[PDB]
Write a protein that binds this ligand. Structure first.
Ligand SMILES: CCCCCCCCCCCCC/C=C/[C@@H](O)[C@H](CO)NC(=O)CCCCCCCCCCCCCCC
Ligand SMILES: CS(=O)(=O)Nc1ccc(C(=O)NCc2ccc(Cl)cc2Cl)cc1
Ligand SMILES: CS(=O)(=O)Nc1ccc(C(=O)NCc2ccc(Cl)cc2Cl)cc1
Ligand SMILES: CCCCCCCCCCCCCCCC
Ligand SMILES: CCCCCCCCCCCCCCCC
Ligand SMILES: CCCCCCCCCCCCCCCC
Ligand SMILES: CCCCCCCCCCCCCCCC
Ligand SMILES: CCCCCCCCCCCCCCCC
Ligand SMILES: CCCCCCCCCCCCCCCC
Ligand SMILES: CCCCCCCCCCCCCCCC
Ligand SMILES: CCCCCCCCCCCCCCCC
Ligand SMILES: CCCCCCCCCCCCCCCC
Ligand SMILES: CCCCCCCCCCCCCCCC
Ligand SMILES: [K+]
Ligand SMILES: [K+]
Ligand SMILES: [K+]
Ligand SMILES: [K+]
Ligand SMILES: [K+]
Ligand SMILES: [K+]
Lengths: 282, 276
């Protein structure tokens, strides 16, 4: 009965797929409901800024105007400060920023603000990730273990003081998982999001949004710690490397937990549908 | 002794940590070696274009140009991008963690929902991706049973056919998931052969710089293209999922052979030295 279970497996893969299709649909509508308006109010006002110099300088080709912008945007992807008051310019591929870049590869964050333009940079980048991603896999795992055992020692002390009359074995894990979410979200989310707000100038929401986008390895790149030129004590960046190293370890378990809650809510809903069928109006 | 086992673990972590830092150092110099130049040649040519525009058109004064370039910088911070299809795309880049970032929420509430969507989305997609890979891995099992019967009744027997089989998984695998889609991307997107492959790997590894996006350029796409890319991503992520894991296990073997080759080398220092 080898196919007995494979027939059953495909039945579970297909329902998870139809539920993933439905999760993309619900989200797809909620984002354009949130973002479609601001996009329009920003295209009407940007055309208002277009005309105020479209006919403010008729002695330009006015086709090269929309062609000029192409030369800027197309050239901004690499990072360009085309200004006359700032002809001197800081590098994006210097000693520290190309060390950053390597980090954003092996950790699959890939912010993208700085990416290779040379065919060699690309070819090396493909080799670098195909090796470096697995390699960094072991480090993050060891950093998960260590960080994990440092918590086993802490709960061995918290699960002995709260041992009062009428204690249970399986219920006390509920108390455990709560302290993991609470203390975790402080050191890896709350505390570092504050330093971001003050060092990068970001808002409270923007710093948290950066933390989540970064430590889930989505890494859009719209916000990046250490991106601007401000001052960067350089006590700053090396601490961020460590935050990433341990902050990734954290979300790895957190995300993995959230999934278990999803099998369970999946079990209790699969059986609640059996109950409902089973009674269904008397 | 519990603290003795933990001392063995921290010794292991600390060495893998050093290898990672030493890997980051190498990469940093090789990228700085490859990208520093093009940055300077493109910084010199963009300064030539900036006066080349003030000279060819005396129409624009120097003071106006700076105002112009400030507005374009703002346009970068906005860009339709949030239509019925792009927002579905976006949702794709979130739950897969690829996150190209060519489209990203600007609303305060779209950022909050993106946090919620991602925390619940990423785990959900993992199950999907876990079954896909499961299926895909059994489909390839029905293929190696067929292959590990026609070759294993004859020429040199087991203990080296397991290495031939994994080359089959890598040879075809690259064809269906890397090569074939890069060919389609080349013609449909206008990307060079390298740029397409570059894209394939930076996407299917969830890196997703967003410097190349399949479907992001303004062009007429057949009705059937974007849906096939989804399926590609779906099945392609599963493939690099294992591929990245194999590479991970190859490093596990090699790292042992180098740890013991260092014991040998020391060790023939050892008894070659005791020879006085
Ligand atoms: C593309 C960027 C270049 C990557 C360069 C990193 C190579 C690392 C240098 C090799 C030796 C590592 C230090 C030795 C540590 C040993 O005491 C220890 C056993 O005691 N071995 C390991 O921990 C296990 C460590 C084994 C891990 C080896 C990493 C595999 C890299 C292979 C790339 C080949 C390219 C050839 C260029 C030289
Ligand atoms: C705009 S720039 O690219 O030109 N300048 C820089 C930007 C960032 C950094 C840096 O080290 N940030 C901390 C860090 C480290 C590793 C990883 Cl994986 C992620 C992060 Cl956030 C340095 C220079
Ligand atoms: C400025 S835009 O936002 O309008 N550009 C777009 C670009 C691409 C697509 C799209 O669907 N691509 C296929 C695809 C699907 C899922 C995943 Cl995860 C990744 C990918 Cl590449 C839509 C819009
Ligand atoms: C685990 C991730 C959950 C994130 C919750 C962070 C809440 C911060 C509130 C700031 C006020
Ligand atoms: C222990 C984790 C502390 C992380 C703080 C990072 C701040 C940036
Ligand atoms: C500029 C400084 C950025 C480089 C910091 C290097 C830190 C390496 C990892 C330390 C943990
Ligand atoms: C297997 C079927 C599981 C059906 C329920 C999926 C759980 C999604 C819950 C998301 C709540 C927001
Ligand atoms: C934040 C977005 C929430 C999206 C959650 C979708 C819920 C879908 C529930 C589907 C239940 C199917 C039950 C099938 C059991 C046999
Ligand atoms: C089930 C569908 C639930 C959808 C939840 C949408 C919540 C929007 C949050 C905006 C702040
Ligand atoms: C999974 C549910 C997580 C809900 C966390 C939302 C809190 C965002 C606070 C932003 C301020
Ligand atoms: C991009 C389209 C390639 C689809 C690959 C499917 C192979 C089976
Ligand atoms: C090793 C990868 C080689 C990729 C070559 C790209 C040719 C186009
Ligand atoms: C086979 C997988 C198909 C996934 C359905 C999503 C279709 C979106 C089309 C985008 C236009
Ligand atoms: K970007
Ligand atoms: K990314
Ligand atoms: K991942
Ligand atoms: K990513
Ligand atoms: K990722
Ligand atoms: K990106």
């Amino acid at each position: 009965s080898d196919s007995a279970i494979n027939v059953m497996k495909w039945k579970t893969v297909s329902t998870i797929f139809l539920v993933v299709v439905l999760y993309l649909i619900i989200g797809a509508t909620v984002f354009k409901a949130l973002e479609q308006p601001q996009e329009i109010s920003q295209r009407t006002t940007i055309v208002i800024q277009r005309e105020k110099f479209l006919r403010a300088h008729p002695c330009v080709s006015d086709q090269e105007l929309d062609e000029l912008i192409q030369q800027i945007v197309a050239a901004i992807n690499a990072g360009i400060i085309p200004l006359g008051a700032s002809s001197n310019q800081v590098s994006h591929w210097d000693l520290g920023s190309s060390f950053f870049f390597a980090g954003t590869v092996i950790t699959t964050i890939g912010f993208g603000n700085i990416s290779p333009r040379t065919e060699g940079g690309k070819i090396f980048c493909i080799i670098y990730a195909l090796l470096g991603i697995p390699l960094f896999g072991f480090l993050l795992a060891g950093v998960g273990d260590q960080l994990g055992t440092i918590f086993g020692k802490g709960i061995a002390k918290v699960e002995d003081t709260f041992i009062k009359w009428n204690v249970s074995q399986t219920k006390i894990r509920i108390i455990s998982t709560i302290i993991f979410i609470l203390f975790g979200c402080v050191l890896f989310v709350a505390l570092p999001a504050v330093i971001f707000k003050h060092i990068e100038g970001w808002s409270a929401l923007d710093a948290i949004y950066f933390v989540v986008i970064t430590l889930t390895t989505i890494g859009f790149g719209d916000y990046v710690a250490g991106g601007s030129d401000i001052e960067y004590l350089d006590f700053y960046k090396p601490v961020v490397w460590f935050w990433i190293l341990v902050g990734l370890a954290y979300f790895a378990a957190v995300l993995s937990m959230i999934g278990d809650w999803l099998r369970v809510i999946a079990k209790k809903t699969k059986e609640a549908v059996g109950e409902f069928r089973a009674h269904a109006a008397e």
